Every structure is written in structure tokens, then in C-alpha cells.
Coordinates of C-alpha atoms in Angstrom, one line a residue:
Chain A
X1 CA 99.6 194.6 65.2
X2 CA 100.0 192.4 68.0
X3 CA 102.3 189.9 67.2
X4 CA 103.5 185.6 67.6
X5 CA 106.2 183.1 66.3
X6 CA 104.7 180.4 64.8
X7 CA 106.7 177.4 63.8
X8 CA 105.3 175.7 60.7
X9 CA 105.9 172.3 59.1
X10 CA 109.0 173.4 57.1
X11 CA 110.3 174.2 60.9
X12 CA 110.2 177.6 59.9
X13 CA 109.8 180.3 62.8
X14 CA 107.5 182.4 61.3
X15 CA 106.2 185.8 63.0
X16 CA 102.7 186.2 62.5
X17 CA 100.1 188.3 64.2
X18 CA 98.4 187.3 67.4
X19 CA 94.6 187.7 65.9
X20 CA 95.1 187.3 61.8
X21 CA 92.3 189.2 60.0
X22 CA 93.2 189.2 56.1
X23 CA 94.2 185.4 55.6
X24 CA 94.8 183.8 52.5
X25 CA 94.2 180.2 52.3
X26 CA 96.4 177.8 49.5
X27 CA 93.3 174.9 49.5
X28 CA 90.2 174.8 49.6
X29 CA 89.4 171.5 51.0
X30 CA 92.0 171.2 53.4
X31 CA 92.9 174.3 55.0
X32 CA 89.3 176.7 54.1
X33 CA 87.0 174.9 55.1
X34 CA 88.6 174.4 58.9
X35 CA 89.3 178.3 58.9
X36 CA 85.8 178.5 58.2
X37 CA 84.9 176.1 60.8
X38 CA 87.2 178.4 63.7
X39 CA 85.4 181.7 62.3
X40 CA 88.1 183.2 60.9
X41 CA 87.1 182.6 56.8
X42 CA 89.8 183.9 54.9
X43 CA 89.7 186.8 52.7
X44 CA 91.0 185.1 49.7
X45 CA 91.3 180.9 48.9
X46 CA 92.4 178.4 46.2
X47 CA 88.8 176.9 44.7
X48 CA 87.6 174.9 41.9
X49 CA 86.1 175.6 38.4
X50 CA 83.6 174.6 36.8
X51 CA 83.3 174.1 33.0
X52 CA 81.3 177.4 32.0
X53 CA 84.3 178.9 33.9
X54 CA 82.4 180.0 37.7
X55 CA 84.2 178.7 40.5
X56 CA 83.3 177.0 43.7
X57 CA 85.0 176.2 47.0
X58 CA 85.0 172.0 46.9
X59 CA 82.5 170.8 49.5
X60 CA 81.9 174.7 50.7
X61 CA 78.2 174.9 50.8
X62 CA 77.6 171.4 52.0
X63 CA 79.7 171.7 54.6
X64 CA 79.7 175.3 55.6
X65 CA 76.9 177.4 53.8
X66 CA 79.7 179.5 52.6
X67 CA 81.3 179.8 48.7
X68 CA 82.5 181.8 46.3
X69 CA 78.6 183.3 45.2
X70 CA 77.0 183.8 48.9
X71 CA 80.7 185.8 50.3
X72 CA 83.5 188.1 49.6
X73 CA 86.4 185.5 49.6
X74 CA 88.2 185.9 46.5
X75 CA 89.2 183.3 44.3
X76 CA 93.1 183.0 43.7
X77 CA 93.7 180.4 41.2
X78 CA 92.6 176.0 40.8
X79 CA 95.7 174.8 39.4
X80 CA 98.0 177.7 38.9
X81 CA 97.9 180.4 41.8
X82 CA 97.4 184.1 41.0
X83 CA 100.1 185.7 42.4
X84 CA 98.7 188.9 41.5
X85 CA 95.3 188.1 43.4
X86 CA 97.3 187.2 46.8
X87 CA 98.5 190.3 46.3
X88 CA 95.6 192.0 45.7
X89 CA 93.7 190.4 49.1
X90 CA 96.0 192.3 51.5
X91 CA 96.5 189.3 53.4
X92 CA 98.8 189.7 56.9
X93 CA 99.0 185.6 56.6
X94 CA 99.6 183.1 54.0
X95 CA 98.2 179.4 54.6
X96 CA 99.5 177.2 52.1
X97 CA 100.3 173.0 52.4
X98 CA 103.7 171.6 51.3
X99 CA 101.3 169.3 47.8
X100 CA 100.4 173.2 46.7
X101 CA 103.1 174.0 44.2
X102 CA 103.6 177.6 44.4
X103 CA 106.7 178.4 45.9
X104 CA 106.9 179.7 49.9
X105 CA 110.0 182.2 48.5
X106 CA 107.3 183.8 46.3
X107 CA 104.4 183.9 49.4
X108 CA 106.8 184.9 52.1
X109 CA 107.7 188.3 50.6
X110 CA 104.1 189.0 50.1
X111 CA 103.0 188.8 53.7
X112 CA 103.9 185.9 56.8
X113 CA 103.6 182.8 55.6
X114 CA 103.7 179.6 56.9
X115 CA 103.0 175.9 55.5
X116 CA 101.4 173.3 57.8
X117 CA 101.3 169.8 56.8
X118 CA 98.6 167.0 57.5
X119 CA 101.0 164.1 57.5
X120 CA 101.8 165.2 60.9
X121 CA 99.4 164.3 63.3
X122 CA 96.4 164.6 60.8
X123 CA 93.2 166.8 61.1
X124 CA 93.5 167.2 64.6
X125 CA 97.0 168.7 64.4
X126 CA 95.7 170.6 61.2
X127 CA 93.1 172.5 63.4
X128 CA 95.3 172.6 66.8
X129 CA 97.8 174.7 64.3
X130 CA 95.4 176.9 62.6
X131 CA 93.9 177.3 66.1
X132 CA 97.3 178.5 67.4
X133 CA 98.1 180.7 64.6
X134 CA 94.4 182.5 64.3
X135 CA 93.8 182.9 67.8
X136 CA 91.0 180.8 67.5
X137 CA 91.7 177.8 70.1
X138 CA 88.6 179.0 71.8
X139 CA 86.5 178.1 69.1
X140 CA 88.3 175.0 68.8
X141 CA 87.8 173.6 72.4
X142 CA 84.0 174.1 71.7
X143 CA 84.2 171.7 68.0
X144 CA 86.2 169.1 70.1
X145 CA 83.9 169.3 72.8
X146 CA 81.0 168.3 70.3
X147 CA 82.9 165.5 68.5
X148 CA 84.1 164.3 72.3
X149 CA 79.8 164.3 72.3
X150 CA 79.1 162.2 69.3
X151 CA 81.8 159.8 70.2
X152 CA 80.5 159.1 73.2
X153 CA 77.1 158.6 72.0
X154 CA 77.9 156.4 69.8
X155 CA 79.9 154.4 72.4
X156 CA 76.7 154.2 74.5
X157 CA 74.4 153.5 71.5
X158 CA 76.3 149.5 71.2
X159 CA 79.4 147.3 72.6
X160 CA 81.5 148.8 69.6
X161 CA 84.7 146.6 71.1
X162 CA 82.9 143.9 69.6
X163 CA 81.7 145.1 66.3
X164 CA 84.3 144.6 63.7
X165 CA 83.9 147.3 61.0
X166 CA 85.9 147.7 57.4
X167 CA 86.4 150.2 54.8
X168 CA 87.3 149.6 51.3
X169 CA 86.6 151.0 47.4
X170 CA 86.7 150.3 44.1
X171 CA 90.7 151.3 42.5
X172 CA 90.5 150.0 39.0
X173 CA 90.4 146.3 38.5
X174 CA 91.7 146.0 42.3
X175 CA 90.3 147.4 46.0
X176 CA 92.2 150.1 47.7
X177 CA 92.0 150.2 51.6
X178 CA 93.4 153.1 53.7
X179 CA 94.6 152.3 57.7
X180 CA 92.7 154.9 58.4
X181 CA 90.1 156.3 55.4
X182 CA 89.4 160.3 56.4
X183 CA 86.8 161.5 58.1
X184 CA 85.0 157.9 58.2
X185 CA 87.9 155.7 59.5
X186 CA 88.6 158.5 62.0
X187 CA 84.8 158.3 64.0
X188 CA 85.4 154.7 63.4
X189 CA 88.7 154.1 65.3
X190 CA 87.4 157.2 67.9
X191 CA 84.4 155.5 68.5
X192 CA 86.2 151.7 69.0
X193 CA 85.4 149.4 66.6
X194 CA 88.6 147.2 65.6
X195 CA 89.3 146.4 61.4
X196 CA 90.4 143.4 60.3
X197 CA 94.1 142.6 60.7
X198 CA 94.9 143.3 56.8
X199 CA 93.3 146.7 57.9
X200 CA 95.2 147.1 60.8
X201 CA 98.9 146.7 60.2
X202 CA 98.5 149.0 56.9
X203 CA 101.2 151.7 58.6
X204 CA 99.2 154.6 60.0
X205 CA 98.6 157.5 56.8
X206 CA 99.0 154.6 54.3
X207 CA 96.8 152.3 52.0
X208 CA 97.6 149.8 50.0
X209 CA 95.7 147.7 46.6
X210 CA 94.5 144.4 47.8
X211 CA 93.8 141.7 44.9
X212 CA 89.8 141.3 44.6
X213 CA 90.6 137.5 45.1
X214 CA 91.5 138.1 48.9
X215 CA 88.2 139.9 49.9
X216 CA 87.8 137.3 52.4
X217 CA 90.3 139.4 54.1
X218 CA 88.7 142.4 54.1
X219 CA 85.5 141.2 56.0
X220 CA 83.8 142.3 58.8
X221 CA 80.8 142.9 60.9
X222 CA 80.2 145.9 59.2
X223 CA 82.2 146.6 55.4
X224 CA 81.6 150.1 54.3
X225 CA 82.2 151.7 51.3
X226 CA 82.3 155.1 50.0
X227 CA 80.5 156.8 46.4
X228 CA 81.0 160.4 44.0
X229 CA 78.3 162.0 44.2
X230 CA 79.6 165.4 43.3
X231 CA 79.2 165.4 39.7
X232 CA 75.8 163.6 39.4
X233 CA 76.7 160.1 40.8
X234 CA 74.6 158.0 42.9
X235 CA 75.3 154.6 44.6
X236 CA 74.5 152.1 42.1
X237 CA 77.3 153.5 40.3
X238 CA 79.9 152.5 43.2
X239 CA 77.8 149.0 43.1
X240 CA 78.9 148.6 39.1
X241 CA 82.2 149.4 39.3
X242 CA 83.2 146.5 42.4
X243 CA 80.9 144.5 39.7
X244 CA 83.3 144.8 37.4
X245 CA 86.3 144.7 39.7
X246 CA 84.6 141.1 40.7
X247 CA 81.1 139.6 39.3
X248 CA 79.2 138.5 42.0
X249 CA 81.8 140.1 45.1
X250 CA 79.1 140.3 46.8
X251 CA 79.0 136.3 47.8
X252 CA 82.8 137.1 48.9
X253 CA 81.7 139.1 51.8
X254 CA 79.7 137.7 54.9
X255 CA 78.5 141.4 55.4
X256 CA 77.8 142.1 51.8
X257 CA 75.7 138.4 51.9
X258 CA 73.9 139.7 55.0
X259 CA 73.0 142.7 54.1
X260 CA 75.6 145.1 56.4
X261 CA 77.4 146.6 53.6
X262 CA 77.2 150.6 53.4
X263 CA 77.4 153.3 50.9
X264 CA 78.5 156.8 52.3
X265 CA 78.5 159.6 50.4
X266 CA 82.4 160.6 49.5
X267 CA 82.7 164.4 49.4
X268 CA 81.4 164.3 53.1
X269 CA 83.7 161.5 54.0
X270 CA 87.0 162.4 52.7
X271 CA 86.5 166.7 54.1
X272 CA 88.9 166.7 57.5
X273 CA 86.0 169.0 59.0
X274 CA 84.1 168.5 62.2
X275 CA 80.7 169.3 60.1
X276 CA 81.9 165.5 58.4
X277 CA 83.0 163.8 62.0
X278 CA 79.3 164.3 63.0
X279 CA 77.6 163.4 59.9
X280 CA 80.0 160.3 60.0
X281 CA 79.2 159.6 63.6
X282 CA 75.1 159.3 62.8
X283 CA 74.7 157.7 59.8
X284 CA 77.6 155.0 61.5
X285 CA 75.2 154.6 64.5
X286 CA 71.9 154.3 62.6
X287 CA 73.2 151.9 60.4
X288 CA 75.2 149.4 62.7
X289 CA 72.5 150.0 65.5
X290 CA 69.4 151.4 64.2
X291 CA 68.5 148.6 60.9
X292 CA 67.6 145.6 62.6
X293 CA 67.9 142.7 59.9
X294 CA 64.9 139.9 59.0
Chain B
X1 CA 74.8 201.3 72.2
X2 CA 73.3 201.8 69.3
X3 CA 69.6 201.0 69.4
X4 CA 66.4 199.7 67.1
X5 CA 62.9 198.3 67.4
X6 CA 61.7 195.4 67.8
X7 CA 58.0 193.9 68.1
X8 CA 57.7 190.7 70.0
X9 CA 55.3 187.7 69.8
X10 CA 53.2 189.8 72.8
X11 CA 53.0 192.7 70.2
X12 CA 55.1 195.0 72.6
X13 CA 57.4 197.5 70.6
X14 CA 60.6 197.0 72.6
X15 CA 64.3 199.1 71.9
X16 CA 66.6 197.0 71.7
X17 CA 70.6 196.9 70.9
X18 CA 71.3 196.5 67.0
X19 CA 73.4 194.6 68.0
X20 CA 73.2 192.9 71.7
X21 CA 76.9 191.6 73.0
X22 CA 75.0 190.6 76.2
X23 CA 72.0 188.2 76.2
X24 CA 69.7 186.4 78.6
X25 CA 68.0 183.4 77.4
X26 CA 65.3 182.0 79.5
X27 CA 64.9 178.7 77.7
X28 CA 68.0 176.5 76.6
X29 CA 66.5 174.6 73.7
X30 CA 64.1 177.6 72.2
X31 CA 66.4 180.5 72.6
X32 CA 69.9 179.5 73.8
X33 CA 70.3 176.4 71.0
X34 CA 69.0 178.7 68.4
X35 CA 71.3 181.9 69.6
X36 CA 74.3 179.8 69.5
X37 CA 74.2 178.8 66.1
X38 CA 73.3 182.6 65.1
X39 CA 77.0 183.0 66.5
X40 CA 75.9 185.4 69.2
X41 CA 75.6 182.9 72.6
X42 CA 73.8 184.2 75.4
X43 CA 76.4 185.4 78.4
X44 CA 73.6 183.6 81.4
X45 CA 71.3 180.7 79.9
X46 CA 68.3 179.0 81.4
X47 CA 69.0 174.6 81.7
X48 CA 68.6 171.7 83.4
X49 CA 69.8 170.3 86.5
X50 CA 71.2 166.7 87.6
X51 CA 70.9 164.8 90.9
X52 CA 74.3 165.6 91.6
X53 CA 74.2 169.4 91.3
X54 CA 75.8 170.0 87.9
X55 CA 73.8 172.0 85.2
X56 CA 73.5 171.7 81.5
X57 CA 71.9 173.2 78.1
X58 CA 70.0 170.4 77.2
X59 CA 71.4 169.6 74.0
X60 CA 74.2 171.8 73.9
X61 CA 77.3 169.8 73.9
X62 CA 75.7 166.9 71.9
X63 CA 75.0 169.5 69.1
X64 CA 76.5 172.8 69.6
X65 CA 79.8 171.9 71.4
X66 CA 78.6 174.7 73.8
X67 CA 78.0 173.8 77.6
X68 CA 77.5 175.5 81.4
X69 CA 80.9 173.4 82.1
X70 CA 83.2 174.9 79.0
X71 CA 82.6 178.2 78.8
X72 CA 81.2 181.8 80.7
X73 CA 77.6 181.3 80.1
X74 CA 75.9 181.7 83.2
X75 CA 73.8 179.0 84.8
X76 CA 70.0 180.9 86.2
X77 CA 67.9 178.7 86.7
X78 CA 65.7 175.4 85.9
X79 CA 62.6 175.9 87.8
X80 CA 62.3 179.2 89.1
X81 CA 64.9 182.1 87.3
X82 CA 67.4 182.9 89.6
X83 CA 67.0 186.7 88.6
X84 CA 70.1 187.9 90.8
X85 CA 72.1 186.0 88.4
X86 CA 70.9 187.9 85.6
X87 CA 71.5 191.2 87.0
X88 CA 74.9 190.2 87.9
X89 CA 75.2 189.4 83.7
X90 CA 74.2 193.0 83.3
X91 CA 72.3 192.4 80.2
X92 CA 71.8 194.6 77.3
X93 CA 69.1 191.7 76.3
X94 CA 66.7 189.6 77.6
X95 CA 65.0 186.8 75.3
X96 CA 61.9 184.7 77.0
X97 CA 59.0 183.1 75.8
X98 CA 55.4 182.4 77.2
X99 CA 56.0 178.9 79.1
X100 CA 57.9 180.3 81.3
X101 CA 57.5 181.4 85.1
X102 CA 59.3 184.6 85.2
X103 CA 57.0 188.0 85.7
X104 CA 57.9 189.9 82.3
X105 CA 57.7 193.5 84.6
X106 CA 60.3 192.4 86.9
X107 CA 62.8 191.5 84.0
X108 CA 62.0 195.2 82.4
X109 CA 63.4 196.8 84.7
X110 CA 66.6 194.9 84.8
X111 CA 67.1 195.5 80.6
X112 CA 65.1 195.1 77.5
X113 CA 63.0 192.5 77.4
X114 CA 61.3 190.3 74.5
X115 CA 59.2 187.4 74.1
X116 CA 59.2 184.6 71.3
X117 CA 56.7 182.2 70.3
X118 CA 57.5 178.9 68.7
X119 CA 53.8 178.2 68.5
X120 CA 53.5 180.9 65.3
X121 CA 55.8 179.5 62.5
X122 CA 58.2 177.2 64.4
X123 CA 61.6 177.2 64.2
X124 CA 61.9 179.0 60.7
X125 CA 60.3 181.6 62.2
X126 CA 62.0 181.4 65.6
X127 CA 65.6 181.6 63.5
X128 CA 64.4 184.5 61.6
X129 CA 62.7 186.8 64.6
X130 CA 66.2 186.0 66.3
X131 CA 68.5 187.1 63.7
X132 CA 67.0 190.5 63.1
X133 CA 66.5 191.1 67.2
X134 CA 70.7 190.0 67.2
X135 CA 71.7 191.4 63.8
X136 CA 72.4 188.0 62.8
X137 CA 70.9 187.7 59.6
X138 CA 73.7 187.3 57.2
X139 CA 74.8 183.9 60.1
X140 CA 71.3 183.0 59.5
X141 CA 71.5 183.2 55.6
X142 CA 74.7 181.1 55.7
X143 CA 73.1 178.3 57.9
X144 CA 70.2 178.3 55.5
X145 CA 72.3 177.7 52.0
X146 CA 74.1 175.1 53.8
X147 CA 70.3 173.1 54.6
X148 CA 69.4 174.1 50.8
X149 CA 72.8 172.0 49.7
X150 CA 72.1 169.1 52.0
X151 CA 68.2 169.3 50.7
X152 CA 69.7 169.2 46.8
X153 CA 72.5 166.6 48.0
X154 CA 69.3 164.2 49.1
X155 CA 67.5 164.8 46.2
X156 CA 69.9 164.9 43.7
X157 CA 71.0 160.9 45.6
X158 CA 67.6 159.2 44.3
X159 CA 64.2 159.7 42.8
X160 CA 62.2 160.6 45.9
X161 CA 59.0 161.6 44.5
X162 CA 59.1 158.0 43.4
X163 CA 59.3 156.3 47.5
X164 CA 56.9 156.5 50.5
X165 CA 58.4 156.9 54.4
X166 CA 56.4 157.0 57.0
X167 CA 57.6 158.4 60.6
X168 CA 55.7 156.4 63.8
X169 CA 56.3 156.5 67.2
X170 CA 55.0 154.4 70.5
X171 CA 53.0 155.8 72.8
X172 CA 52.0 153.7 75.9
X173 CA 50.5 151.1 73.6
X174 CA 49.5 152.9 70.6
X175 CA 51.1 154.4 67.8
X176 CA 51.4 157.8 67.8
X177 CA 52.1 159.8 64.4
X178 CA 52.6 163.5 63.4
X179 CA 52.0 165.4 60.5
X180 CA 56.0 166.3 60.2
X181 CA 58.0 165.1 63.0
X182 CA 60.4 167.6 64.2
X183 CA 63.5 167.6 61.8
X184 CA 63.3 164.1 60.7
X185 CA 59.7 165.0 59.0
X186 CA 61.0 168.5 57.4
X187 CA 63.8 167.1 56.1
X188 CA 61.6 164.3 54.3
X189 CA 59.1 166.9 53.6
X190 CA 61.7 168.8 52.1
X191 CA 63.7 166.3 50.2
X192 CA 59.9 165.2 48.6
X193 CA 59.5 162.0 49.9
X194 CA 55.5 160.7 49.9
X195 CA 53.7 159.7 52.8
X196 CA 51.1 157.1 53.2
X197 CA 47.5 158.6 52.9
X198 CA 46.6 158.5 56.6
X199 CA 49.5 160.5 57.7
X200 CA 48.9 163.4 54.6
X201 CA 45.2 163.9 56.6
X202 CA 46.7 164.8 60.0
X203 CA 46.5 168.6 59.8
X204 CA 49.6 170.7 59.6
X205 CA 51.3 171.1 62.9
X206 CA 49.0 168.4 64.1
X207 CA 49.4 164.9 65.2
X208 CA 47.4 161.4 66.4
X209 CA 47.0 158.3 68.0
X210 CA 45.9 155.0 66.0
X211 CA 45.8 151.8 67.7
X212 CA 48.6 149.5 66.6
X213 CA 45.5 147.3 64.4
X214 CA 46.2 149.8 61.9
X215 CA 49.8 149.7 61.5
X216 CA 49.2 148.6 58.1
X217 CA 47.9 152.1 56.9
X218 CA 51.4 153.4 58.4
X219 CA 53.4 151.1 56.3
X220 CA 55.9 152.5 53.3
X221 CA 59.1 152.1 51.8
X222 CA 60.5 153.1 54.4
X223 CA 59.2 153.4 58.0
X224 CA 61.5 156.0 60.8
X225 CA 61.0 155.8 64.2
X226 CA 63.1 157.4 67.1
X227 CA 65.1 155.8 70.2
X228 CA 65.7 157.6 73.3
X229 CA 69.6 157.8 73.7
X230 CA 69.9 161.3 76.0
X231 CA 70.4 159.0 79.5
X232 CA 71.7 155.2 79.0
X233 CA 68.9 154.6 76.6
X234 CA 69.3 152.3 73.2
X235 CA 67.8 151.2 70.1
X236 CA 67.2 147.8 71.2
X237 CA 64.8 149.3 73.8
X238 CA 62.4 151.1 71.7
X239 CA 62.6 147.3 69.8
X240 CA 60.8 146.0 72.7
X241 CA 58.5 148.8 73.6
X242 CA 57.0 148.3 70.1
X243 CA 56.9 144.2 71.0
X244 CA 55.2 145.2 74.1
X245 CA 52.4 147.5 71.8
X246 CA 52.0 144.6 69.8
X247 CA 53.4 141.0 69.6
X248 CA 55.2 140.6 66.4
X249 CA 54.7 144.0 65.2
X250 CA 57.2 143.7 63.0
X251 CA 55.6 141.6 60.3
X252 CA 52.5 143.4 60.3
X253 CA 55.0 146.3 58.5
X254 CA 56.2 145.2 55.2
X255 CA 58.7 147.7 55.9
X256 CA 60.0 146.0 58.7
X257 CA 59.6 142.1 57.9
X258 CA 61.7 143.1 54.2
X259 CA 64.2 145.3 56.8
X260 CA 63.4 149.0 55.9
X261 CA 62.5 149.4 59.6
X262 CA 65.0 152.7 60.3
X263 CA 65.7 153.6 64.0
X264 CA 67.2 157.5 64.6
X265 CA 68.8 158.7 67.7
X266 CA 65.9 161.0 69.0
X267 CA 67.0 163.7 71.2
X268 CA 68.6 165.4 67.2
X269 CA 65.7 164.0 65.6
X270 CA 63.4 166.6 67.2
X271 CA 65.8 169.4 67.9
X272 CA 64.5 172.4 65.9
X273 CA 68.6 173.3 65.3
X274 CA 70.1 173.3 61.8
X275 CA 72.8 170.7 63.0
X276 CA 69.9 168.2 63.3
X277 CA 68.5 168.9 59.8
X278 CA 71.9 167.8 59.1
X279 CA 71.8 165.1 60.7
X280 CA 68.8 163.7 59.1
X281 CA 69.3 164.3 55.8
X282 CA 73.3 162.5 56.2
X283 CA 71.1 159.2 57.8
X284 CA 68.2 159.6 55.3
X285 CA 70.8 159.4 52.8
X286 CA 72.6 156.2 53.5
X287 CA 69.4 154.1 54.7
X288 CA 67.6 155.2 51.8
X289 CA 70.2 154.6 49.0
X290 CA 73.5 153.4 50.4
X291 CA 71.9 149.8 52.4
X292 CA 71.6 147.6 49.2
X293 CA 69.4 144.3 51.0
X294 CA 70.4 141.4 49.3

């Protein structure tokens, strides 16, 4: 009952309540997962579906412990939203993004809704403004506090203003690179470590398709590289694909000659949760700091 | 104030809250570490003290985001229980264990009063005896399909019934080696990986020194060890302890000459918490599978 104007994205001035309790979430990925994070799930959220038809929340479990099968979060809809489930969820606040499609004229005469957007400011702007709108800044301060933790650990663990560090993948015939590449470019630039200038003047939220001919360009101390594992995939797979992007790449990278090129697992990379910023953070220290080469 | 039973590790029959909003922990990392993840912190927590004056739960921050410093929990004691502090808490639980100092008559009379024992069935055990004295068991479920997802994520990354690990340790010039170390040795355990003969005869819960001479029958695939990070520490210096146990160590382990030698930040490595098992599994991942060696 308690009430608060919220003013989304859109620069919509939205009245919300102070302490939501029936939210509905528009994605999974990007907006469940950190209400789950700030312990207030919502009551219904946009999921996935698998081909014999069940339905999942993308990277739930992993990340979380919490789906679809082990909760009472509805789901609403993959691709095309169920209006009629939103409505059915008694929500008192509608999450959605401004890359969902269903219209905020249709959601804002179901219940307060407001549409929040990750282009500005990124994850930690994300969670600041689902903080502020869930009551949940609390909860918040207590994640940062723990990523504020690991980043500092990591800085301890090495001189990380003088490891240069790289991420790139596989994009069809050509490598893609990001400025800053989700969850694992994020601990990365947090922690210190400086990319190579290719890396660095791509403007911040962009990437751009680098021709395999200047990897040279993309070296560093430290080139990682991310593989799908989510639908049965392992590493090698990631390893066969830059294979055929360039035979024998490999000899194009000092790091990749040496023996300091690094396969993450994708799903827990690309999630803009704090469960990924620490997982990111470990296997990063372990792997520049704890594998000494012959 | 509604009420149930509970029957600690003592075999006392203690009422208790259902559900306890107020809870004294006597020990940070056995009780406190534990409680937090259960999403039910304690309102006054045992810890440790600095030089300076400030206090801390050992491992709190680093892995829970939860400190003395960021929130209400009450600081009572390192050495001796500052039991004035706890009054002034007014618990409706108190939560100790048999290491500890603390007459278990004077802390009766202040509230209810149980006592936990790591010693029978470890932290699975500790989790589960915690949950149903906080009504935390559907937390405690939730924790636990997130560690089954990580366990199939592992598993599902590579054939580990096909490759050997092996998890050693210094110890003032000898190599000490446990049965399962802390998480690092579940999470193995768990995921399926072999060990080498010698360490599959060390009883369960059981450990052993071997002089360095035999760092041979400790060799695998892949051999762990753990650096002390907690206070300045780094990798590098557990590097030259092991020179220090033996001059060139490092090719008397195939593991290590070939560079499968695997160095883990320790202080999450033998945390009982679910964030460490987390941990693990994330840097087991990646050093396993995702560090091609040219």
C-alpha cells in the first residue's frame, strides 16, 4: 500500500509501491535472475522452452538454485508474452526491458509498470534500479560489498597493472571482440588489467568483427575466450570453430603459443549476476596466477 | 512465538522458535557463515579481532558480502563471549558448539540454547540441523539444486571418470594429504574424478603425512594445492615453500614438469559454505578443460 515514483528508462514517472510483493519480470536472464539475487523473486517471468515443450528459466539453476520445476513463478510466455498469464499473476509491478516486444500501453493498464534499460550504466545501474524500485538496496549493499571482496583479492593475488589480458570469439569466418565482454570483461577491467589498444578504443557497450588476419592485434599476456556449453557443448568445440576461422591461429597468438589462452564457460559469463562476477573473479585468478608454466 | 523441538548434538531436547528472528552464533565460520546463507543471519555473531581494534566474521565479506562493519550483527566476542552483549541482543536463539568456552548453563538462562557438532556429518549435516532449528529448509533445498547444477555442469564439461587429480599440501617439510579436502575434494569427489591409489587408502574424514620422497605416488592428471591469500599472502609463496620441502619438486610431479600443477586461493577452498563449492567447481572447470597446453 505504501507507495514511490520511480522514473524508468522511458523517463517515465511511474508510481510503484515502496516494498513490491507480486512482480512480474519481462526476461529471464536479465532482469530474474537479479530479482532473485535481491530476494524479491518474482511471482511470474518470461523463460525458455525446451523441445518436449517444459520450460526453464535460462541459467536459473546454475546460477540461483531456482526454476520453473523447484518454485511457484509462473511462466508467461518465450517469444510471444501471455497477456492473459500477467494477468493472471496479480502482479502490483511490471519489469520489462525496451528489446522485449510487448507493448508498455498493454502492461501499464495491468498493473505499474516500468522499463529499465542496460545500455545505461550496465549491470550495476540494472541492480541500483531494481534495488530502488523493490526496496531491496539493503540486500544490494551486501552483493557489492562481496564483489568489492573478490576484486580486491584478486588485486592482491598479482601486479594486475601489468598483466595485459584479451577477450575475443569465434563470429563466423571472422573474431568478434566486445570493449567490454559481460560479466568476464567487467571483473577484468574492476580488477585492472589493461586490453590491447584494438580492445580499448572499441566505444564502451560496443564490439566490433576483427579480420582473423590481424590477430596479432588482439594479443596479450592473457587472451581468453568464451564456449556453449548449454546444449551439450564442451571446449574443443570452441577450439574447432577458430580452426576453421584460421588453421593453425594458434601460432598467431604469443599467448595461444605459450600456453595462456583460456576457455570459460559462456552461460556463466555472459549472466549480469553477481553469482557470475565471483565465479569470473576465481577462475581469472587461478588461471593468470595459480598455473605456473614449464 | 510460536514454538517446536529440537534435539541437539548433546542430545538435549530444547524448545525452540519455529521460526527464530533473533539468533546468537558463537562461532563465525561453523554457525554464522552457514546461517547467513540459510537467509536468516544471526542479530550478535562470534569473530575475530585485528591489532587495531576492528572485528570481523572471518570469511564473511570475502564470501557472504556480510560483515561486523556493514550491517547490525553484533560483535561478542573472540576469546572469551562477551555475554552482556548477548543479553542486550535479546535472543530468541542461541547456536553454539563444543569448542567453545562459554558455560552452556549460563547461556540457558538468557534464551534457548543448542549445540552443533561438525564432527558428526560435516557440513551437510551442519546445513541440514540448521535449516530445520531456523525453518530454513526450503533456502536450504534451493542452495542444494543450485550445487547439483554446478556438479552436472562439471560433469557434463568432460569425461571425468576417465582423469586422476590429486589434492597435496606442505606441511613444515612434508606433504600433507587428506582423504577429501574441504570443498575442493567434495567437489572432485562429486564431479567423479579418480584419485591416485595412496590417497583412496586414507580413511574417510582422515588425513596423512608422506615425506616428499614419495611425491611420485601423489602424482595425477592433475595435481591442486592451496595458497594462503587471507593476509598479503600469494601463490608464488606456497611456490617456494614447496622448493624449500624439496629442491626441484616440481619435476619429480609429472603433473607439474607438463604444467598441470593447479594453485587455488585457500581460505574458499576449505570453507564448508556453498559459495565455495562454487567456486571450485567454476576453477576445476577451466583448468581441467578450458587450458589447452600447447
Amino acid at each position: 500500500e505504501p507507495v514511490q515514483v520511480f522514473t524508468d528508462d522511458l523517463g517515465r514517472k511511474v508510481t510503484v509501491p515502496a516494498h513490491p510483493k507480486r512482480i512480474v519480470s519481462l526476461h529471464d536472464l536479465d532482469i530474474t535472475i537479479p530479482l532473485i539475487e535481491l530476494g524479491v523473486p518474482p511471482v511470474a517471468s518470461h523463460g525458455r522452452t525446451r523441445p518436449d515443450g517444459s520450460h526453464f528459466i535460462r541459467s536459473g539453476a546454475l546460477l540461483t538454485g531456482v526454476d520453473f520445476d523447484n518454485s511457484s513463478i509462473a511462466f508467461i510466455g518465450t517469444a510471444d508474452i501471455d497477456i492473459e498469464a500477467i494477468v493472471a499473476a496479480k502482479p502490483d509491478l511490471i519489469i520489462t526491458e525496451p528489446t522485449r516486444n510487448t507493448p508498455i500501453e498493454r502492461l501499464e493498464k495491468i498493473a505499474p509498470t516500468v522499463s529499465i534499460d542496460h545500455l545505461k550504466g550496465g549491470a550495476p545501474e540494472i541492480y541500483r534500479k531494481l534495488a530502488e524500485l523493490t526496496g531491496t538496496q539493503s540486500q544490494l549493499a551486501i552483493l557489492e560489498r562481496r564483489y568489492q571482496a573478490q576484486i580486491n583479492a584478486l588485486k592482491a593475488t598479482l601486479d594486475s597493472q601489468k598483466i595485459t589480458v584479451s577477450v575475443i570469439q569465434a563470429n563466423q569466418g571472422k573474431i568478434n571482440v566486445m570493449h567490454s565482454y559481460h560479466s568476464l570483461g567487467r571483473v577484468l577491467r574492476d580488477a585492472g588489467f589493461r586490453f590491447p589498444p584494438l580492445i580499448e578504443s572499441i566505444p564502451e557497450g560496443g564490439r566490433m568483427d576483427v579480420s582473423a588476419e590481424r590477430l596479432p592485434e588482439l594479443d596479450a599476456d592473457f587472451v581468453f575466450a568464451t564456449w556453449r556449453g548449454d546444449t551439450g557443448g564442451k571446449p574443443q568445440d570452441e577450439l574447432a570453430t577458430m580452426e576453421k576461422v584460421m588453421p593453425g591461429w594458434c601460432q598467431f597468438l604469443t599467448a595461444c603459443r605459450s600456453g595462456r589462452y583460456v576457455l570459460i564457460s559462456r552461460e556463466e559469463a555472459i549472466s549480469n549476476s553477481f553469482a557470475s562476477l565471483g565465479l569470473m573473479a576465481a577462475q581469472i585468478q587461478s588461471q593468470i596466477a595459480g598455473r605456473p608454466l614449464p
